[PDB]
Amino acid sequence: TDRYEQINDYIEALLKPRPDNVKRLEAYAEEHHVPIMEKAGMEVLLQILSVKQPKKILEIGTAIGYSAIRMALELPSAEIYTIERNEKRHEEAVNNIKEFQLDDRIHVFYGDALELADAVHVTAPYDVIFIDAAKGQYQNFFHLYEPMLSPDGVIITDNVLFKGLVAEDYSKVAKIDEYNHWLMNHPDYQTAIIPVGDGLAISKKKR
Amino acid sequence: DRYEQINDYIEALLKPRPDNVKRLEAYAEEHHVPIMEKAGMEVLLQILSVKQPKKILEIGTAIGYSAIRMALELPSAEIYTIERNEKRHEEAVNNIKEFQLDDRIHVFYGDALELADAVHVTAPYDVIFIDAAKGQYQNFFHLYEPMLSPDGVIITDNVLFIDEYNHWLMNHPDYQTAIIPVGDGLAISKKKR
Ligand SMILES: Nc1ncnc2c1ncn2[C@@H]1O[C@H](CSCC[C@H](N)C(=O)O)[C@@H](O)[C@H]1O
Ligand SMILES: Nc1ncnc2c1ncn2[C@@H]1O[C@H](CSCC[C@H](N)C(=O)O)[C@@H](O)[C@H]1O
Ligand SMILES: [Mg+2]
Ligand SMILES: [Mg+2]
């Protein structure tokens, strides 16, 4: 256990335990290897959103609706639009959202996010775009959906450090490392990388 | 270890600051001034850039580095900062003067536990950044969180590199807090409702 995982455990040990129905989602995700947001990364996400106070959020990668539900609980007035291409997890997301009674505010698209731009554009623009899907298609998601961002909006990307594997010589992850370089050298966006959980990138339109 | 490797990776990605800012970073390294770590400062500024605060309170100026960085990020913002060491206060005032930010950044001299009433004149504050003596963190929070705006944010550096404060802060009834493991550790606190 290195210093990174020790600190993560220390932070997790300080967290207030979530409600029972939220813990059930975390338990299910562990059981079925659903890569939901790490506990520590989720807390940082929510606190940034709580500062941002967004009215509309776009999420790419619903899985079982965990992050969408957490975000919704944090922001009672906010509406959330989320995409998922897997049929089973889409099914689970819709049932979970229904069970929490957040189906009035959380809206799930079914299908690949690279083919749903026009349907998502109907309810653009979005104050926050949260990218948390296939790592190889990160640059495509950003390019496709950052026109729908509000003027003072923020794009947040999970899994940009990838368990610290991007930081070392990884060749013998190149796509993630490329995205990070591409994102940090973007002419329209200023970006900070937060080393929490699996790594968060927070991007914002330049002045 | 992995922690320092990730930090180096993030530092390697950073766009280089202006020359006068780099001189502050160089001076701080030369003279063991514990300014905000490069990676931690970027996270701070990006959160502030989202917050877009009009008034910031800072406890622990040192040589004016974090105050200057915050000021450059937020052209409209006014910053009020405290420093009890005479030499660092001297350096802060000269640095701020050299950057020509002395119209917007205002430095108090003295212990922050004895300057509450002078700070209260220009209350309230959208952001309170605590970055001073680690032993007096609970006293700073108690003293200065009444001057926080309704939708304000309290940010504490040096929470990982104290254990009592972290427990105290995480179990505060009026505030919700997340810990960011970057640099020396950041805590971001905010009113629950
Ligand atoms: N191109 C694509 N279009 C839409 N869905 C995607 C995508 N590629 C991956 N996915 C989905 O995105 C999910 C990533 S995991 C999502 C985790 C979730 N945000 C949480 O924290 O709770 C997977 O379930 C996968 O099915
Ligand atoms: N109780 C107190 N009142 C005011 N100043 C304090 C304090 N205890 C510590 N200090 C000052 O706070 C500084 C901590 S270093 C501050 C670093 C600065 N925020 C930056 O990132 O650039 C020290 O220079 C110390 O002199
Ligand atoms: Mg993820
Ligand atoms: Mg510090």
| B41, amino acid identity | M
Query: How is B13-45 classified by DSSP, letter by letter?
Result: HSPPPPHHHHHHHHHHHHTT--PPPHHHHHHHH
**Cα separations (Å) of A188 from A207, B43, B152?**
9, 18, 28
Asked if A49 and B188 count as a contact pair (C-beta separation under 8 A), the reply is no
Beginning with the edge strand found earlier in the chain, give each strand of the sheet holding A106-110 in spatial order.
Answer: A106-110, A79-84, A56-60, A126-131, A149-158, A200-205, A189-194
Opening angle at CA A169, ends A166 and A174, nearest 5: 50
Residue A187 phi/psi, 5-degree rounding, is -75, -20
Query: How is A40-76 classified by DSSP, letter by letter?
Result: HHHHHHHHHHHHH--SEEEEE--TTSHHHHHHHHH-T
How large is the angle between the packed helices A66-74 and A87-100, nearest 10 degrees? Answer: 30
Q: Rounded CA gap, B123 and B80, in Å?
A: 10
Inter-chain Cβ pairs, chain A and chain B, closer than 8 A = 103
- Minimal-distance CA residue to ligand 1 atom 24: A63
**Three-state DSSP class for A141?**
helix
Interface contact A168-B5, CB threshold 8 A: yes
**Three-state DSSP class for A196?**
coil
Q: Are strands B105-109 and A56-60 parallel, antiparallel or unpaired?
A: unpaired
Q: Rounded CA gap, B52 and A151, in Å?
A: 14
Q: Rounded CA gap, A106 and A108, in Å?
A: 7
Q: Is residue A67 marked as binding? A: yes
Asked if B177 and B167 count as a contact pair (C-beta separation under 8 A), the reply is no
Ligand whose nearest atom lies closest to the CA of B132: 2
The per-residue b/e assignment along A65-74, b for 16 or more CB within 10 angstroms, e otherwise, is bbbbbbbbeb
- The atom number, within ligand 2, closest to the CA of B62 reads 24
Closest in B2, B13, B185 to A184, CB measured = B13
Contacts of A44 in chain B (CB under 8 A): 178, 180, 188
Asked if B40 and B184 count as a contact pair (C-beta separation under 8 A), the reply is yes
**Three-state DSSP class for B128?**
strand
- Kindly state the tokens that stand for B167: 């427990």
Tokens 């917050």: give the residue.
Answer: B51
| B186, amino acid identity | L
Chain A interface mutation, best of B36, B37, B43, highest count of A Cβ atoms under 10 Å: B43
- Minimal-distance CA residue to ligand 2 atom 11: B60
**Three-state DSSP class for B60?**
coil
Cα first-last separation, chain B: 39
- Kindly state the tokens that stand for B93: 């005032």
Opening angle at CA B133, ends B106 and B161, nearest 5: 120
β-pair partners for B57: B80, B128
Please name the residues in contact with A49: beta carbons below 8 A apart, sequence gap of 6 or more: A57, A71, A74, A75, A128
Interface contact B50-A51, CB threshold 8 A: yes
| B121, amino acid identity | V
Determination approach: X-ray
The per-residue b/e assignment along A26-38, b for 16 or more CB within 10 angstroms, e otherwise, is beebeeeeeebbb
Nearest to residue B66, comparing CAs of B28, B100, B31?
B28
> What range does the domain containing B112 cover?
1-193
Rg (CA), chain A: 16
Q: Rounded CA gap, A93 and A72, in Å?
A: 13
Opening angle at CA B78, ends B173 and B18, nearest 5: 110
Q: Using beta carbons and an 8 Å cutoff, which residues of B are at the interface with A? A: 1-3, 5-10, 13-15, 39, 42-43, 45-47, 49-52, 75, 151, 153, 160, 166-167, 170-171, 176-182, 185, 188, 190
β-pair partners for A155: A129, A203
Interface contact A3-B8, CB threshold 8 A: no
Nearest to residue A158, comparing CAs of A89, A92, A59?
A59
Contacts of A2 in chain B (CB under 8 A): 1-3
The H or E element that residue B151 is part of is: strand B148-157
The H or E element that residue B156 is part of is: strand B148-157
Q: Rounded CA gap, B170 and A205, in Å?
A: 32
Opening angle at CA A21, ends A64 and A135, nearest 5: 25
Chain B interface mutation, best of A1, A16, A48, A127, highest count of B Cβ atoms under 10 Å: A48
Q: Is A133 exposed, middle or buried (0-12, 13-18, 19+ CB in 10 A)?
A: buried
Closest in B1, B15, B151 to A2, CB measured = B1
Tokens 């339109």: give the residue.
Answer: A205
Tokens 């296939």: give the residue.
Answer: A134
**Total domains in the fold of chain B:** 1
How large is the angle between the packed helices A138-145 and A174-184, nearest 10 degrees? Answer: 30
| B60, amino acid identity | G
Q: Are strands B125-130 and B55-59 parallel, antiparallel or unpaired?
A: parallel
Q: Rounded CA gap, A18 and A11, in Å?
A: 14
Interface contact B10-A193, CB threshold 8 A: yes
β-pair partners for B128: B57, B154
Asked if B71 and B79 count as a contact pair (C-beta separation under 8 A), the reply is yes
Interface contact A164-B45, CB threshold 8 A: no
Q: What are the residue ranges of helices labelled H in A65-137? A: 66-74, 87-100, 117-121
Measured between CA atoms, how close is B96 to chain A, in angstroms?
22
- Kindly state the tokens that stand for A47: 């606190």
Q: Rounded CA gap, A82 and A37, in Å?
A: 15
Residue B53 phi/psi, 5-degree rounding, is -75, 150
> Which CATH number does the domain housing residue A107 bear?
3.40.50.150
Q: Is A107 exposed, middle or buried (0-12, 13-18, 19+ CB in 10 A)?
A: middle
Asked if B58 and B79 count as a contact pair (C-beta separation under 8 A), the reply is yes
Q: Rounded CA gap, A134 and A35, in Å?
A: 11
